C-alpha cells in the first residue's frame, strides 16, 4: 500500500490551459460554467444600476440625474435581469447536470450548445451597447406598450438594438431548449425508465416545452415592430386594434417568460431537500402531476395583466389564475412534508432553502392577494406589485441558484466552499432583503405609482425611501464575501476526492469521481429506484426502504 | 453675427479689447493646427469645428 499522492492538486494548472480550450470547446460542463460566469457579470452590472437607482430615488428631488436617463436606466435594469440572467442560468444548470443527472455520456448536439452560448453572449453585448449612443438606449420600460414604441416616439437607435438583442437571445434560448428536449427524449441510460428520473429532469423538460411554445411569438412580434419602425407598416396604429393586439400577444409571451423561471429551481430545491433530510421525496407521482398541471395551465392565464384596460372578460381569467394557484401549494406541501420529522442539519444550502421558502411564501401570499380584479383596480402599477414580483423572482432565483452552486461546486471543481463565509453571506443577504423590500407595501397602497423620477416634499414617505436605500446599500456589499470565497476556494480550500461530499446523496449523480473525466462515466450501477447511489452505498438498507414505503 | 441677447459671456482677449464691434467678431479661417480651413460653425453651441481633424 502507501500510495503516493500530491500534497495539493495544481492550483491554476499549466500556462495557457483555458483560452483555446474555451474557444474550440465541445464539453457541456464548461459551457454551463461560462453561462454561470456571464450570469454573474450581468447580475453585477444590473445590481450597480439598481444601486444608482435607489441612491437617486432617496433625497426627494433631482440631485444629479435627469428624467430620460432614469427611464433608460430602468429599461436596462429590467431587461438585463429578466432576459439576460435567469434564462441563461437555466441552461447553465441544464448543461451542468442534466446529462449527468440522466446518465447520458454527452449531449445530443454539442455544436448547438456552443452555438447558442455564443449567440446569447453576442446578443447581450449588442443589446447592452446602447449607452454609447448620445441619445442613449431605449427609453420605454420593458413592458413596451404599443404607441410609444412606434417611429413617431422614441426615434433613437436604442430601441433597435434592444429589439435585436432580444431577438438573438430568444433564438439562442429556442435552440438550447430544442437541444435539451432532444437530449432528454433520445438518449438515456439502458436500464433507465421515465418513471424513475429525478424531478429536476421533469421540470426542465416541461420548461423547455414552454420555451418552444412561447418564444417564436416574440420573434414574430419584434419582426413586426421593427417593420413598423423602419417602414411604417401601419400594424400597431391607433386607428386599428393594434393597441389591444400587441398587448395581448406580448403578455401571452411574457407571462410564460416568468413561469418558465420557477419550475427548474423548484426541482433544484426538491433534490436538495432529501440529502439533508435523509428521507425520500414526498409525493413523487403527485409532484410530477402537479408539475404537468402547472406547465399546461401556465399559458391560458395571460390576460390577467389587462385589468386596467377594461376590455377583456374578467371572471374567466380570474378563475383560471385561482386554479393555477393550487398546484404551487401542492408543491409547497410536498416539500414541507418531505422534511417533517427528520434529522435536519443546518448548513449553508438548506439555510438558503429556508430563506427561499420564506421569501416565496410571502411573495405567493402577495400574489394570491393581487388576483382580485377590484383590488387590482386600486393597487395596480403601485409599489405593491413591485414588491410582489421582486419577492417571488429574487427569492426563488437568487437563493436557489446560490444553494445549487454551494451543492454542486465539488462536483464540477472537486473543491468545497467554506461554510462560515457562506453563513455570513446568507445572513447578510437575508437581512438586507427583508429590510429594504418590506415597507413598499405601505408606500405602495397609498399613492406612489412605479417608475417615478421625483415627487413632492408635501407628501410624506420621506423616510421609507431612506430605509429602502439603507437596505439596498446593505444588500449591494453582501455579494463581495461570496466572490472572495469563490475566488479563494477555486484554487485553494478543502479538496474532496471521495464521492458524494454531502453524504446520503441521490439522483444517480454520486456514483462517479468528483472530478468528472470526459464522457462522465467509467461504471454504472443497477437501476431499481429513484435513489440508486443511496442504495449502492448502503445495500443493507434496501429491505427497510421497500418495506415501509407506504406507512404514511 | 452673434445673438445680441447674451453679449455677456465673451472674454475680450487680453490685447484685443476694442477689436470687436457689437455683434461682429470677424474671425480668421486658416486653422492653426495644420492649415486646413474650418467652415463648420454651430450657432447654438458657439463652436467652430475643423473638419480635417475635428
Amino acid at each position: 500500500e502507501l500510495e503516493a499522492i500530491r500534497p495539493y492538486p495544481a492550483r491554476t494548472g499549466p500556462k495557457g490551459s483555458l483560452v483555446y480550450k474555451l474557444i474550440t470547446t465541445t464539453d457541456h460542463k464548461m459551457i454551463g460554467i461560462m453561462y454561470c460566469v456571464a450570469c454573474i457579470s450581468f447580475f453585477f452590472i444590473g445590481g450597480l444600476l439598481a444601486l444608482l437607482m435607489r441612491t437617486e430615488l432617496a433625497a426627494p428631488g433631482l440631485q444629479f440625474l435627469s428624467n430620460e436617463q432614469f427611464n433608460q436606466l430602468f429599461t436596462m435594469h429590467g431587461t438585463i435581469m429578466l432576459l439576460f440572467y435567469a434564462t441563461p442560468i437555466v441552461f447553465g444548470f441544464a448543461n451542468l447536470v442534466l446529462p449527468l443527472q440522466i446518465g447520458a455520456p454527452d449531449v445530443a448536439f454539442p455544436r448547438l450548445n456552443a452555438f447558442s452560448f455564443w449567440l446569447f453572449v453576442f446578443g447581450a453585448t449588442i443589446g447592452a451597447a446602447g449607452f454609447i449612443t448620445p441619445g442613449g438606449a431605449a427609453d420605454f420600460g420593458w413592458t413596451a406598450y404599443t404607441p410609444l414604441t412606434d417611429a413617431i416616439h422614441s426615434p433613437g437607435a436604442g430601441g433597435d438594438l434592444w429589439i435585436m438583442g432580444l431577438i438573438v437571445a430568444g433564438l439562442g434560448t429556442i435552440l438550447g431548449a430544442v437541444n435539451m428536449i432532444t437530449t432528454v427524449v433520445c438518449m438515456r441510460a439502458p436500464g433507465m425508465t421515465m418513471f424513475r428520473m429525478p424531478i429536476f429532469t421533469w421540470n426542465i423538460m416541461v420548461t423547455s416545452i414552454l420555451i418552444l411554445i412561447a418564444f417564436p411569438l416574440l420573434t414574430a412580434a419584434l419582426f413586426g415592430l421593427a417593420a413598423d419602425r423602419h417602414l411604417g407598416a401601419h400594424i400597431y396604429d391607433a386607428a386599428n386594434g393594434g393597441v389591444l393586439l400587441w398587448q395581448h400577444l406580448f403578455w401571452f409571451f411574457g407571462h410564460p417568460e416568468v413561469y418558465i423561471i420557477a419550475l427548474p429551481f423548484f426541482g433544484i430545491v426538491s433534490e436538495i431537500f432529501p440529502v439533508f433530510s435523509r428521507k425520500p421525496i414526498f409525493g413523487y407521482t403527485t409532484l410530477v402531476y402537479a408539475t404537468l398541471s402547472i406547465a399546461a395551465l401556465s399559458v391560458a392565464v395571460w390576460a390577467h395583466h389587462m385589468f386596467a384596460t377594461g376590455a377583456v372578460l374578467l371572471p374567466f381569467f380570474s378563475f383560471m389564475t385561482y386554479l393555477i394557484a393550487v398546484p404551487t401549494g401542492i408543491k409547497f406541501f410536498n416539500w414541507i412534508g418531505t422534511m417533517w420529522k427528520g434529522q435536519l442539519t443546518f448548513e449553508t444550502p438548506m439555510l438558503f432553502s429556508v430563506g427561499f421558502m420564506v421569501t416565496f411564501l410571502l411573495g405567493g401570499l402577495t400574489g394570491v392577494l393581487l388576483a382580485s380584479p377590484p383590488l387590482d383596480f386600486h393597487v395596480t402599477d403601485s409599489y405593491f406589485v413591485v414588491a410582489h414580483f421582486h419577492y417571488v423572482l429574487f427569492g426563488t432565483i437568487v437563493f436557489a441558484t446560490f444553494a445549487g452552486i454551494y451543492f454542486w461546486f465539488p462536483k464540477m471543481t472537486g473543491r468545497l466552499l467554506d461554510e462560515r463565509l457562506g453563513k455570513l453571506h446568507f445572513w447578510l443577504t437575508f437581512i438586507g432583503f427583508h429590510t429594504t423590500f418590506l415597507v413598499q407595501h405601505w408606500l405602495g397602497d397609498e399613492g406612489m405609482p412605479r417608475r417615478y423620477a421625483d415627487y413632492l416634499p408635501t407628501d410624506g414617505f420621506q423616510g421609507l425611501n431612506v430605509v429602502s436605500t439603507i437596505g439596498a446599500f446593505i444588500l449591494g456589499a453582501s455579494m463581495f464575501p461570496f466572490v472572495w470565497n469563490v475566488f479563494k476556494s477555486w484554487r485553494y480550500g478543502e479538496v474532496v476526492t471521495v464521492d458524494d461530499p454531502w453524504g446520503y446523496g441521490n439522483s444517480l449523480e454520486w456514483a462517479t469521481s468528483c472530478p468528472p473525466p470526459r464522457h462522465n462515466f467509467t461504471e454504472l450501477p443497477r437501476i431499481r429506484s429513484e435513489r440508486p447511489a443511496f442504495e449502492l452505498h448502503y445495500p443493507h438498507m434496501v429491505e427497510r426502504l421497500r418495506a415501509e414505503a407506504h406507512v404514511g | 453675427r452673434i445673438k445680441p441677447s447674451d453679449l455677456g459671456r465673451v472674454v475680450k482677449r487680453k490685447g484685443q479689447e476694442s477689436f470687436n464691434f457689437g455683434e461682429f467678431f470677424a474671425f480668421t479661417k486658416v486653422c492653426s493646427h495644420l492649415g486646413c480651413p474650418s467652415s463648420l460653425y454651430e450657432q447654438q453651441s458657439y463652436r467652430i469645428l475643423c473638419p480635417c481633424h475635428q
Binding site: 502507501l2 500510495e3 503516493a4 500530491r6 500534497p7 495539493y8 492550483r11 442539519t345 448548513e347 485553494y492 480550500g493 478543502e494 479538496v495 474532496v496 476526492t497 471521495v498 464521492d499 458524494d500 461530499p501 454531502w502 453524504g503 446523496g505 454520486w510 456514483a511 469521481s513 467509467t522 461504471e523 454504472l524 450501477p525 449502492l536 452505498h537 448502503y538 445495500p539 | -
Partner: protein, 143 residues
C-alpha cells in the same frame, strides 16, 4: 473491509463517501504551509528532474532496511531521492536511486541531514524539510 461508505465497483475503482461535516485529508498542518512545501517540492523537482518524496511515519526497526523497502513504492525508484522522518524515534534518513548517482548525491546527504536536524530542535518540521529539500536540490546537478 469496505468501510461504510466505500463499496467496490464493477471495475477495480472504489467509490467512497463521507459525512458532510467532515473533511477527506485530516492533515494536522496549516493550509498555506502545505501549499508552500508543495510549491518548493515542485519547483525543485522540475529543475533537478529527479523525483523527491517525503515520509513522516515511524520506522521502529532497522531504519536503513525499512527506508530502502519503502523506496519501491516510488513510481520511478531508479531515479528518486527519498527523505524519511520518524518524529517518535527522531530518525532522519536519506536514500538514493540507481539512476541518480554521481549527480551530487554523495555531496548532498550530509548537508541536507545537518540542515534538517538543526532546523528540528526549534519545534518546527515543515520548514526544516523545506530547507533540506532546497539545499539538496541545489547540491544535485542535472545529468
Amino acid at each position: 473491509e469496505l468501510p461504510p461508505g466505500w463499496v467496490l465497483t464493477t471495475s477495480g475503482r472504489i467509490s467512497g463517501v463521507t459525512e458532510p461535516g467532515e473533511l477527506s485529508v485530516h492533515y494536522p498542518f496549516p493550509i498555506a504551509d502545505l501549499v508552500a512545501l508543495d510549491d518548493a517540492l515542485t519547483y525543485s523537482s522540475r529543475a533537478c528532474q529527479v523525483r523527491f518524496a517525503i515520509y513522516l511515519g515511524d520506522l521502529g526497526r532497522d531504519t536503513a532496511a525499512r527506508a530502502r523497502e519503502i523506496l519501491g513504492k516510488v513510481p520511478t525508484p531508479d531515479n528518486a531521492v527519498l527523505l524519511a522522518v520518524s518524529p517518535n524515534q527522531c530518525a532522519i534518513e536519506v536514500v538514493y536511486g540507481s539512476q541518480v548517482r554521481g549527480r551530487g548525491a554523495e555531496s548532498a546527504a550530509p548537508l541536507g541531514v545537518a540542515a534538517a536536524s538543526s532546523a528540528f530542535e526549534q519545534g518546527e518540521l515543515v520548514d526544516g524539510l523545506i530547507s533540506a529539500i532546497r539545499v539538496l536540490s541545489a547540491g544535485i546537478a542535472p545529468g
